[PDB]
Structure formats: structure tokens, C-alpha cells
Amino acid sequence: MRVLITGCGSRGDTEPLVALAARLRELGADARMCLPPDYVERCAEVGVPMVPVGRAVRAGAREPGELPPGAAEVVTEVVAEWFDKVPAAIEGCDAVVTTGLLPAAVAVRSMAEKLGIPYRYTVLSPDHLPSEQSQAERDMYNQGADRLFGDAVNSHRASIGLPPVEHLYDYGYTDQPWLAADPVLSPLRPTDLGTVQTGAWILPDERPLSAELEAFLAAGSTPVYVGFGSSSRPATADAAKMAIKAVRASGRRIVLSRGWADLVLPDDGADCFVVGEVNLQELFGRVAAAIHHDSAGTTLLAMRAGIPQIVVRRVVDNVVEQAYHADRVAELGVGVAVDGPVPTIDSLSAALDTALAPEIRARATTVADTIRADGTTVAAQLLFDAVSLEK
Amino acid sequence: XXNXXYX
Numbered sequence A: 001m002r003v004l005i006t007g008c009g010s011r012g013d014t015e016p017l018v019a020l021a022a023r024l025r026e027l028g029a030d031a032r033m034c035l036p037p038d039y040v041e042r043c044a045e046v047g048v049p050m051v052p053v054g055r056a057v058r059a060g061a062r063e064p065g066e067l068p069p070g071a072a073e074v075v076t077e078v079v080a081e082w083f084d085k086v087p088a089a090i091e092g093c094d095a096v097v098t099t100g101l102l103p104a105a106v107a108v109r110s111m112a113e114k115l116g117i118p119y120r121y122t123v124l125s126p127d128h129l130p131s132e133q134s135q136a137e138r139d140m141y142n143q144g145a146d147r148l149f150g151d152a153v154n155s156h157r158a159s160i161g162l163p164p165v166e167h168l169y170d171y172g173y174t175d176q177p178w179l180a181a182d183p184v185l186s187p188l189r190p191t192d193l194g195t196v197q198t199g200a201w202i203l204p205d206e207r208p209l210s211a212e213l214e215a216f217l218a219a220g221s222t223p224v225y226v227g228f229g230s231s232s233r234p235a236t237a238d239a240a241k242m243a244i245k246a247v248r249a250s251g252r253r254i255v256l257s258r259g260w261a262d263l264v265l266p267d268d269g270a271d272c273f274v275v276g277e278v279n280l281q282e283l284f285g286r287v288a289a290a291i292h293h294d295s296a297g298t299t300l301l302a303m304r305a306g307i308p309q310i311v312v313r314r315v316v317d318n319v320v321e322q323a324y325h326a327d328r329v330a331e332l333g334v335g336v337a338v339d340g341p342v343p344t345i346d347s348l349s350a351a352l353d354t355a356l357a358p359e360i361r362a363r364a365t366t367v368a369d370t371i372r373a374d375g376t377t378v379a380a381q382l383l384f385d386a387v388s389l390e391k
Numbered sequence B: 001x002x003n004x005x006y007x
């Protein structure tokens, strides 16, 4: 069995795919990948063959003026790019697993269709499952897409043999997209019954922390973590500042992450430490708690890490949009959710004080063991079944 | 307006 894994999005959209591919070849299967140039180092790092496709997702890795790949402006160029590079890679494959940017998702499904190999699209959060969308929301998306790239797709489609297609939202996401997320954190809801949930796809990180970090994590008190992953909004920097301040008001050390926003410490202070690529799994098991963005991957890792959390709501929790993970952590009682984009120092100091309180420093250590550690395996077996049946 | 992300 050989599987192709496609994707185009933030790192939270990619790490899960890299985990699946790592797990597949670990089980004997073979896995190739198609991702933006951003993840070449990471892939080579994990030992998973990968083909660089399209533009870079992170601004700091592109020309000052080349818009992001998700930018409508350049969508046609996208559809075109994939249909061009995927071939060499999808050839010899038995199944395709993809996620992220719909344009490319569709382009990929197409090529899997020409080969006759099964295709699967996965979402990382329940609220993205079309079953959680309003029958209205559906058509809107469909139209939008059908409008934005509906042609460039069919062109290349007709260019290899297959006929046209419409409602690309339903096409690229499929009638039953997968939910690669853990049950405790991201539970399903009636609207989504026969929906496959495998648990999150996590790659057991074995990378050791640098000698420096190890030193710091020895030259003092057990620190709090501050990071915002792929977050690159300008507020990100302000948020980090306030967080650093709040944690310092608590009288605790800090371990900050540069992330995609390229943050930096503000003092030569010995109570802080900035890190680039680090083994979060490893680090989370060596900090007091973690302050971070409303994201899938980080929230779960800190949950299986067993440490409390402070999640920054992207905006005010309104009737038309709520911070899923942030709220989820609150509802589970493993952390505090603070409103943003730039939370007050008071809110964070309070949130921090609540979090490191027995009640939470316990619900967290306990919930940590209810987390599924076999998501990648479940997806792999589900893949094995697909290939055997429909092919 | 019809394609995804996240960025």
C-alpha cells in the first residue's frame, strides 16, 4: 500500500498530515506528500519524502509582494500548479488523504479520480464539518468556489480526461469528510452522526531540547509557556507582550516561542527564553501552564501534556462566532479563556492565577489520560479498508 | 470568498 497526503495551510493544518505519513511508513506502508515549500525541512526532519507545491504559506518565507496561496487573487495559478506537480507524486498511489485549501483539494481529488484510487478529506475541528454548517451555508460556499475556480478546475479536468464538476465544496470535502480530532476536546454533535472521528493525528516527538533550554529549565523556577503558533496578525505581538507581563507579575519565568509572528523577548532578563523550532510535547511536560492561541494542535498537545491552559479568544465571544477550543478548555475545566485580540494584563493575571489553582491543576492532570493516543493508527486502518473495498 | 486557509 502507498498513500499520498496533500495539504495547504498553517502548520496546524500540516503537522497532522506529516504524522499520518510518518505512521504509515512506520507500519510498512509508503507515504509521499505534497505541501507548500514551507514544510521541506520538517519533512526531511521526520524522514518523509515530500514534493514542494505552490507558494509558501508563511509570509516571512516569500517575496514582499507575493500574496499567500489562499489569496483569491492567485487562485487560478494554484489550481494550475497542483494539476501540474501532483501527477509525478500521485502515480503509483493507492489512496489520497488531503486537507486545507479547497482549490488544491479539488485538484487533487480529480487526479485521484482519474486513477480510480479512493480519496479522503479531513477536517481538524468539528465546526468545519459540513454537517455543522447550515444547509444555507453549504450552497454559499459551493457557489463561492464554483465561481472562484469552477472553470480552471474543469479545464485541467477535461485536460486529462475526466468531465466537469460543480458544487466543489461538497466535492473537495466529500459527503463524509473525516474528523481528525480527539473525542474529549472536540466531540461531535447530532448534526454529524455517521461521521468518522479517529482522534487527533499526533507524531510522538523524540527530538531532545537544546542544551541551552535544558540549562534554563534548571537555572530557576518552573516557567509558564507563551506562544501563538502560526498566528501572524499584528496583535499577536501585543498579546505576547501582555502575556509576558502577566506571567512576570505572577513572579514566574517565561519561555516564549518566535512562532510565525517572529516574536522577541523585550529584556535581556534571565527570567525569559525565546525558542524557535522546539519539541512542544517535550516542553509542555516541563512548564507550569501554557498561554496560547485558540488552535487545535497546541490545545490538544497541552491537554495530553496534563498542564492547565489560558486560551486567547480571537475576538469577543458573540452569538455569531465563539472560540471553539478556548471555550472547550473552559467547559472541560482545564484552563481559562481570555478575550482578545489583546487581552488585558489583569485578565491574564487573573486567568493565570485561576489556572494554576488546585481545581484546574487537577482536572487537567486527570483529563490528560483520557486523550486518545492512536489517531494515526485508526486513520491508517481506515485507509487500508478503503483501498481493499472500493479499489 | 470560497477557498479556505488557515494562514
Ligand SMILES: Cc1cn([C@H]2C[C@H](O)[C@@H](COP(=O)(O)OP(=O)(O)O)O2)c(=O)[nH]c1=O
Binding pocket: A010, A011, A012, A013, A015, A228, A229, A230, A231, A257, A259, A276, A277, A278, A279, A280, A295, A296, A297, A298, A299, A301, B006
Ligand atoms: C511552534 C511549534 C509547533 N509545533 C507543532 C505541534 C503542533 O501540533 C503543530 C500545529 O500547531 P496548531 O496549534 O495545531 O496550529 P497553528 O498552525 O494554527 O498554530 O505545530 C512543533 O512541533 N514545534 C514548534 O516549535
Ligand SMILES: *[C@@H]1O[C@H](CO)[C@@H](O)[C@H](O)[C@H]1O
Binding pocket: A127, A128, A133
Ligand atoms: C469556514 O471558516 C470560517 C472562518 O472562521 C467559518 O466561519 C465557517 O463556518 C467555515 O465553514
